């Protein structure tokens, strides 16, 4: 106690925040750590629940509803004065049960970006870019290239023609009804795949991959956020920011993300938090220290966000975010952005049928939570597991292979593997990256008494744990 620790992406302008943290020492004499550690998302709940953790933790508004549900989060307390400072749609994102959960800090949205030199206009459908990419194949280029390993550049194509993550309907959403598995979504991930199979793109370009080969010049277009556009204007290239191609004449639906700052329920320094985000980070002085590192895009402050409206780049993310969909910040968000990793990843390997990984992805998203530890893992199923009400039994269900021997623990509601990831892994690879774990989930009631016809309850959905290779 006595100073402030702040966890916030490495792909956000965390040099900038550190500078408004120098400030906030030469005024209060509190030092400012701000840190930017891999996978901070999945981290943090691991410490804060401990008691450690950072004071200050930065992320899209999509995980705080589950951190709040864990009780991670302490509750903030802004006057109406500070309320009227910020956009009433950037509150509404991190507010969870009647509650106030975190500071809307800025608004984000995925859009196209395109080297004009290479390609003065931009293709405004998905459907154009196959054959503009024999065009530049022709003389040493790509047409398109982004982080296909993160569902969240993925989906705004998935969820064009019909693709939702959870059913919004009386006023809140029904955790059990996902859209991944349905035609729209079949419709957009198949396409990805073509262009896959294609050899329009690689299986295994990811977010540096893209972004080094936009930046050198080496393709014509790429997909992503404002925080992107400081590394491309440092790169010289004539670039340009517009929206996305619409996939089978609707537009691309990219998730509404609203970077959000809360704070640790274990944190010591409530009182000091509150003051440095109310007082340093969200005014015009803060929010320009930051957006000059990494471009926040559309600040949720209104005074900072009028100065920045005339960016035509921040017109174009409006135009995305507008033509797109805010996330939910249920605690259901990190199951499905699991299933959905998983489904696109295993499709664009040609390892699944668009078919069977958006099938899987639905029944993951539902009813499946995978935690994957150091040599650890640990997999809870609803026991509820179709919907209907009839919950499944404990010895009916298996994990992996044979040589499997999972601790096997069983609530009303759920059942919970406890497995060795030596013991446990039907499969293991290796990317640019990560050394990949992969096993099966399998539900197998059979043999059944009765004459098992029309749905069949006989469900398999991968099982899989991805650690960086440092
Ligand atoms: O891809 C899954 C991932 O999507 C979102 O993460 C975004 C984040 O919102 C952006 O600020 C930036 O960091 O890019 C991320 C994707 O690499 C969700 O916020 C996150 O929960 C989810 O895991």
Request: net charge negative; proline share 6%.
């Amino acid at each position: 106690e006595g100073k402030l620790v702040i966890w916030i992406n490495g792909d956000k302008g965390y040099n900038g925040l550190a500078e408004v943290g120098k400030k906030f020492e030469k005024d209060t004499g509190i030092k400012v750590t701000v840190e930017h550690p891999d996978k901070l998302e999945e981290k943090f709940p691991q410490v804060a629940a401990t008691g450690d953790g950072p004071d200050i933790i930065f992320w899209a508004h999509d995980r705080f509803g589950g951190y709040a549900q864990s009780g991670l989060l302490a509750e903030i307390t802004p006057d109406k004065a500070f309320q009227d400072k910020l956009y009433p749609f950037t509150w509404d994102a991190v507010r969870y049960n009647g509650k106030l959960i975190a500071y809307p800090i800025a608004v984000e949205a995925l859009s196209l970006i395109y080297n004009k030199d290479l390609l003065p206009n931009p293709p405004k459908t998905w459907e154009e870019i196959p054959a503009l990419d024999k065009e530049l194949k022709a003389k040493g280029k790509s047409a398109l290239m982004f982080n296909l390993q993160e569902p969240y550049f993925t989906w705004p194509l998935i969820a064009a023609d019909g693709g939702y993550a959870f059913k919004y309907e009386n006023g809140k959403y029904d955790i059990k009804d996902v859209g991944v598995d349905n035609a729209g979504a079949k419709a957009g991930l198949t396409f990805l795949v073509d262009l896959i199979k294609n050899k329009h793109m690689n299986a295994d370009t990811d977010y540096s991959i893209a972004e080094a080969a936009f930046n050198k010049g080496e393709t014509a277009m790429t997909i992503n956020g404002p925080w992107a556009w400081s590394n491309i204007d440092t790169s010289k290239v004539n670039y340009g920011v517009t929206v996305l191609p619409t996939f089978k004449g609707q537009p691309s639906k990219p998730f509404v993300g609203v970077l959000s700052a809360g704070i640790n329920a274990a944190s010591p320094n409530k009182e000091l938090a509150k003051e440095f985000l109310e007082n340093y980070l969200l005014t015009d002085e803060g929010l320009e220290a930051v957006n000059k590192d990494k471009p926040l895009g559309a600040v949720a402050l209104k005074s900072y966000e009028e100065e920045l409206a005339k960016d035509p780049r921040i017109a174009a993310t409006m135009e995305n975010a507008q033509k797109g969909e805010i996330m939910p910040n249920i605690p259901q968000m990190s199951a499905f952005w699991y299933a959905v990793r998983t489904a696109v990843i295993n499709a664009a390997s040609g390892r699944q049928t668009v078919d069977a990984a958006l099938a899987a992805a639905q029944t993951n998203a539902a009813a499946v939570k995978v935690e994957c530890l150091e040599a650890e893992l640990v997999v809870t199923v609803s026991r509820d597991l179709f919907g209907t009400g009839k919950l499944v039994q404990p010895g009916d269900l298996t994990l992996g292979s044979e040589g499997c021997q999972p601790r096997v623990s069983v609530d009303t509601d759920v059942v919970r593997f406890n497995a060795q990831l030596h013991e446990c892994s039907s499969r293991v690879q290796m990317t640019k990256d990560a050394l990949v774990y992969s096993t099966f989930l399998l539900h197998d009631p059979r043999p059944v008494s009765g004459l098992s016809i029309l749905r069949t309850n006989r469900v398999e959905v991968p099982i899989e744990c991805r650690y960086p290779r440092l």
